[PDB]
């Protein structure tokens, strides 16, 4: 059962990790969405 508990927490690890790891990949998408026409803005 100690294998059963910790393997369940292994699955409880990467589940909530990858939900915010994709949300971490949401970070550099906005900055290439925001600041790329901003070069045209001063121009």
């Amino acid at each position: 059962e100690q294998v059963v508990v910790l393997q369940a927490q292994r699955t409880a690890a990467a589940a909530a990790l990858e939900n915010a790891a994709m949300q971490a990949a949401e970070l550099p998408v906005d900055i290439e969405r925001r600041l790329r026409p901003i070069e045209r803005n001063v121009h």
């Binding site: 927490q9 409880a12 690890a13 909530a16 990790l17 939900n19 915010a20 790891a21 949300q23 971490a24 949401e26 970070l27 906005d30 900055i31 925001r34 600041l35 901003i38 803005n41 001063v42």
Partner: protein, 48 residues
């Protein structure tokens, strides 16, 4: 003398206002960034 300087005053209102839009949206993007970091450090607290 008034129309050409007002045409420049539109360009004064063009760029100097749009620069101030840049500063606020980055700070709003810091709310988008820190919501990830609030989430990520919370995940390890569910493990520990």
């Amino acid at each position: 003398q008034r129309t050409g300087r007002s045409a420049l005053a539109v360009l004064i209102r063009a760029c100097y206002r749009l620069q101030q839009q840049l500063q606020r949206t980055r700070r709003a993007l810091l709310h988008h960034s820190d919501a990830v970091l609030t989430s990520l450090h919370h995940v390890r607290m569910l493990l520990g």
